[PDB]
Design a protein around this ligand. Structure first.
Ligand SMILES: Nc1ncnc2c1ncn2[C@@H]1O[C@H](COP(=O)(O)O)[C@@H](O)[C@H]1O
Ligand SMILES: Nc1ncnc2c1ncn2[C@@H]1O[C@H](COP(=O)(O)O)[C@@H](O)[C@H]1O
Ligand SMILES: Nc1ncnc2c1ncn2[C@@H]1O[C@H](COP(=O)(O)O)[C@@H](O)[C@H]1O
Ligand SMILES: Nc1ncnc2c1ncn2[C@@H]1O[C@H](COP(=O)(O)O)[C@@H](O)[C@H]1O
Ligand SMILES: [Ca+2]
Ligand SMILES: [Ca+2]
Lengths: 455, 454, 455, 454
């Protein structure tokens, strides 16, 4: 009866993406807001800006509010939100309540300083930044790196296996299966590196970004330095100093754009794998409800759909998050509640990709037969050699010779024997030893050396 | 506990969109697939194409597999699916086992005909078609029609209330608040009419759309006509004859495009109401300021309409393409139709909540109009021209050079520069104010239902 | 040196789309604005709202301003626009000038009534509506209907030609080449009908949509009825009564969405044709710069790109045109100047599709060999017949029999002979006459009857 | 006559973006392809991989094919293309015929090596890479940097000018005009830094990316290292080793995404300036009203930034996918990179034109602040709390119940409800006004270049 859920995220695919609810769910949002509030009061206590330090034990009681958050804690916040119709204000009340309800006298004194000087977005943006960072570092990017590792394994394992290339869908100079996978490794590797280099930013600046309240409360405090310390020490966050009521969200747009480019590469992979399978060059480990031996690339297909959905959210984010009327409009708040959904679609797709990739094997006989039926792809190296030995208009010579004939091995090798005999005999012999399977350039070297040679 | 859900659809906003799960959830899809399977067998029984009509009571027993589907039945399908890793197959197995266990001879006889001649998409597309049609007809469009009704109520109630227009954000010829709401009514009315006219289509054509199986099974049956009947009689659906393994989905794209255009109009409305409120011209029925009331319903709507539209653009771009006789990437995409409509419903309910908080601020409306006498420049020029004056604009410009234009200056222009006019015309110009220069705004606002057209 | 143009529309592809400049170019916009201004004054003359009718000859002199618009007329408008920095105001001045510069005394009287009561958007929206309507009716939809006719011709011509279907890329029950093309006909036919049914709307309502000026000028005139007459009589346009300073643009969004769905179907076509060619089932009329007999589906590929570009504009339009702050912001004006570009990308793509489709022929031998190597697709009709004669678990019987075997003709027909012998012998004989080429259902009937049977 | 062009890029806005045609037009692409071909042959000559170094003067003659390309040369390539229907092939033919006609023996000898070992995309991708890099470095980014400079000039000049903030469109704690411009400066500075750090990549790897031809032609050459050298020495480009027939285009997507994020920030700015102007707080340096001046530069920018972003979203979604070792659908898409940057340039030039019309309206700024004393609710509560007051919000709410909050009421609250405060603190509260309650807005605005970070 998670089966009665409308979103396939919380419905059909909940098993695939459930680990995300610790980062993104209203429960996790409430939890992290409580933590941010508690950490702020702990920092005010540390700094003694407004009161003398509470007792060592009162500090641990203050801590425990943030380190032991229960389901009932969450229900309590929701209960209060029914009164307030303000979700962050409900958390202030909750934290003050737990302080009132504590034994401690010093804690009863300092409870009025909960949320002191803050605006709601001070709490929210840190909650989101810490959840997003931890989600990507602990769940989403590791899943991407698993796909990357499997592509590298495939690149090395099949580095030598000749494969007929297709440009415009049609036969072209050979590659190897390893090399084609190496190409996807190299791109995913680059995408992961760009994404990991985006800095997750936060701010803590009050009503409109200017420390208005803070300046009145404590005129000799350098609030820019004090907040930078707060965010670094309590959250390991970079501080984006310039903001209105909202953090600008540009780092979210950067991350999402990065993930969206990764997703594009993965869609490219999914469709190529589908096409290799269509052409019977790859086989899948055991399907069709009517044909007993038919096995379909349904993991790649499911992945392709969910990568497109993830990218829809990601385009929405980068398009709408950067704009907010004056010192803010609230339309960004609901949009941001869908960051979790966007990364769920990524995770569903990435896990399907992994499942698909682990099912594939090469079909050597089919790979070989295709290559041996596509001798026309040897046109270029014959011309290249002819030209190296001063032949003029090599392509026209081959064109003339093959005119009105169906090009095959016999014709290509007759062309070498009777039209290239002017070459040194060792060069002629090497032309005669070339096959579409052996004309693969440095595909094998490049495939097995991709870890080292990719930028 | 729904608080641990990742999607805001099933978490924070569950209350606002929960009525959608009867149409769109895996439970709803399972339920409707079972119904399609049962009705196909009922139809084969009616038609006697492959066996003689079963007993009257056996057709009652068959129908009850469809008319009493429980959470238990749903969990059973899911259980079978762990084995099959094929969802529709798991429904075939389920209907068969209900038939095996029925304690009816003639039903044991016909159970091998469950899903006879069908492909899974025959079942899926009818299930989606009926769910989407019912959802729009019963939940989604009536919610849009409630916004329409409120906009028309606002248009009538405030038809006569003058409002300083703004073009490029700056003062322009007056309108009325009711008229500005009538504009949105006329557009939503048009959109709803377009959406209602989209024909919901379905197919039931076997593996690849060609009745391959059907033709072998019963070579003298006119299957085009038989399926037309099946779809109309059992589901009240329009038959789209041409298909591959999949129904083309073009009608879904059309409905989605239509919804997205209505959403764009509603975004236009949300931002304008926000601007009127910002300019203190409307009032509404803040954690720091004691008397501050913010347009948070309209802001929430605005955000959720953008989200619905992201899905809608996705559907319209990806649904139309499928590799050859189909690739399966559409299956997972279609599972998001309910989410897209949940964003709509959340947004529409926020609009309704916001519109019901609206009141005019008459004093601020009047004060603004009374400080924007420069907007009477055009009617003064219009009337000068009517009485054969040449370059009326340059004359007014000449007169106001270096002056800050206000009431005194504009009425001085009329009295001293327009005195050549008939005195009755002079007198009418001198009675004009920005609040009375509203053209047929009041007329158009009151008559919008009657004049908005199709 | 149209080759120095930045847009490929006015550069590389100008030959393909040049007929559009009569509808959409700054030249055409100026031209149609002049016509709208002249027609308004003609209507004021007809109606005698503000002056007694000019002389019969003065009417023809007034007409000739709109029916003889030259390149120098256009340069003159631009010259004036350098002064005004207002493009419509420059047209008012131009029309007044031509009236001043006319002989006529009555025309010298009425020239002050040029643009009388109008706002600039009154002129613009009618200019755009008439250009858009005429462009779609005369150029864009006829090109689409040409593709539709070619698909119908292909559907009928090849209605009988058996073709191995592929679902998930893999073998499935047969169809015919005609039938697959018939499917595209049926969708394009539906799209064209939806698009032709959108009503092109216009308005003519002054500053803010309310007839403010008009009501003061002529209090007893029913302006709603008078404008409806003006738009019908002078332009054959539907009147959208409700507007601000701008016509709402919703009909443009409807048309563009319609074209975008058509484009999606055509992208589906382009990729399917590419895949049939990849699989050597279709051949192209005569390529590769290195392989002498290679001919690539470059027309389909070029079409696929330009359909995506057209759809980018179309998504932009439906997303941004519906919103405009209060009684308008001007950001819609520049957006609308790209309607022409959007339809140029459509026309480039549609002409490439036509060029590609006229190059295709079937490759019967390849079509036949593939079918005859895919006997596994006969699994379903064997099971269907077994079941009709009371066999239980037919699929499992076939599965058991083929276990560990490579399914081929011999195995499938041995299954019929030795596992289906319980069937009436006439049914057994019909099973034994079935081939993948003859198992095509009613594909042939449906393909040749698509004109009549499509909805 | 350019007035007959369909695209506004080459029609109405030709003047604003014409400098782009040197980077992006078919003429520019033809020109750069010729240059790549010539430099490859020059490189084979330097390396002596297939023939001995030609004569000193023959290398001068070869280089001049590249350094003096004319309109005539371009028309010649086009002429050849009518025959070939292959654009790069037409360039091979052109360079060869320049060589055949050169009147040099050693050049007649080596002309068969034009395009040796290459695929057309070897030539195309280097041509695009160099054009895109130069365009961004020389035209596009410097135009963004001019907006940055102006925003910083505004931030400094108006650092101290108080401005009533608006959250949800309604009064909030003050800021300053310079501070609100500093916010945009900091974001554009960040975006420009990201865009500048994208590495422009190229390849030169033959038919399918594997040096198939190269390996057969010269089996002992380290081609990975040789091409690295070619690309760095002749074009100053980074080598992306891994490719199919096509370069992957990922770096184009990254640049485009970066530009699109800068565009979103500039859209945010255009709408905010429009809102400030609407609220009469800024003034600018109408066919009907004689004194009306509209923000048409910002409105034009807003529209063209949406257009640039439509292309950018297109590129990022379609460029990354290519069927197998490539499909040709990317070719026609890449021809639109120049158009996308022309929309950017048009928009950036409109922003610059608008920002240069800006002045503050001090009286209207001051008057608004002086009518919004309710915004001092927070600092009053903050200070009460600091001196141990409990539920300060409820106290102020209690006091203002049923009252329209104004200066008199707020100062009465301080004098009668906050009198328990130290008198110096009371005195400071009584000296606060909404115009002086601006926190560190002035400080942050003046220090933005120094504090915006990377
Ligand atoms: N200025 C503000 N900053 C942050 N949150 C706010 C602000 N004003 C109201 N809210 C609350 O933000 C939440 C927005 O909910 P939603 O639109 O569903 O994301 C509600 O609980 C609002 O009361
Ligand atoms: N040809 C088919 N038609 C319809 N459904 C299918 C087909 N092949 C597989 N399926 C099933 O459809 C479901 C796709 O799931 P998802 O990708 O999560 O939408 C899986 O249960 C597949 O086994
Ligand atoms: N209220 C208005 N209605 C229509 N056009 C206007 C208006 N105000 C200014 N314009 C002009 O519209 C044109 C817009 O140019 P662009 O932004 O390049 O499309 C300019 O010539 C402006 O002067
Ligand atoms: N494999 C290829 N690589 C690069 N260009 C090609 C290839 N095959 C064909 N072309 C040419 O690229 C151009 C594509 O033009 P367009 O579709 O207008 O961008 C045509 O001149 C084609 O002949
Ligand atoms: Ca194949
Ligand atoms: Ca205002």
């Amino acid at each position: 009866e998670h089966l009665k859920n409308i979103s396939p995220i919380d419905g059909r695919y909940k098993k695939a993406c459930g680990e995300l609810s610790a980062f993104f769910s209203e429960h996790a949002l409430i939890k992290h807001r409580i933590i941010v509030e508690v950490r702020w009061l702990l920092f005010l206590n540390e700094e003694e800006l407004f009161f003398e330090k509470v007792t060592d034990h009162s500090v641990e009681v203050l801590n425990q509010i943030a380190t032991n958050i229960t389901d009932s804690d969450i229900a309590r916040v929701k209960a209060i939100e029914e009164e307030t119709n303000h979700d962050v204000k409900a958390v202030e009340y909750f934290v003050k309540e737990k302080l009132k309800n504590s034994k401690r006298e010093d804690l009863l004194k300092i409870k009025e300083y909960v949320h002191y000087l803050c605006t709601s977005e001070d709490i929210n943006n840190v909650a989101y930044a810490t959840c997003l960072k931890a989600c990507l570092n602990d769940v989403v990017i590791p899943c991407l790196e698993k796909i990357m590792l499997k592509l590298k394994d495939l690149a090395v394992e099949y580095s030598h296996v000749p494969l007929l290339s297709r440009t415009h869908g049609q036969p072209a100079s050979s590659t190897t299966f390893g090399k084609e996978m190496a190409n996807f490794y190299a791109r995913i590797h680059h995408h992961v590196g760009v994404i990991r280099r985006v800095k997750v930013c936060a701010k803590f600046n009050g009503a409109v970004g200017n420390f208005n309240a803070h300046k009145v409360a404590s005129k000799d405090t350098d609030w820019v330095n004090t907040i930078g310390l707060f965010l670094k020490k309590h959250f390991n966050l970079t501080y984006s100093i310039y903001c209105t009521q909202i953090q600008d969200h540009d780092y979210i747009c950067e991350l999402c754009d990065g993930l969206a480019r990764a997703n594009g590469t993965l869609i490219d992979l999914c469709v190529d794998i589908w096409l290799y399978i269509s052409n019977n060059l790859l086989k899948l480990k055991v399907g069709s409800s009517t044909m007993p031996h038919k096995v379909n690339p349904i993991d790649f297909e499911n992945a392709e759909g969910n990568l497109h959905i993830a990218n829809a959210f990601f385009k929405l984010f980068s398009s709408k998050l950067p704009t907010s009327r004056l010192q803010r409009d609230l339309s960004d708040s609901t949009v941001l509640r869908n960051i979790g959904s966007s990364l769920a679609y990524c995770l569903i797709a990435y896990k399907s990709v992994l499942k698909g990739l682990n099912k594939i094997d090469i079909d050597r006989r089919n790979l070989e037969e295709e290559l041996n039926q596509n001798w026309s792809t040897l046109a270029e190296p014959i011309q290249i050699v002819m030209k190296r030995h001063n032949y003029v208009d090599a392509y026209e010579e081959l064109k003339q010779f093959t005119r009105g004939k169906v090009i095959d091995q016999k014709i290509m090798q007759e062309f070498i024997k009777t039209k290239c005999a002017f070459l040194p005999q060792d060069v002629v012999d090497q032309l005669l030893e070339l096959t579409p399977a052996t004309y693969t350039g440095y595909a094998d070297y490049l495939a097995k050396n991709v870890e080292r040679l990719s930028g």
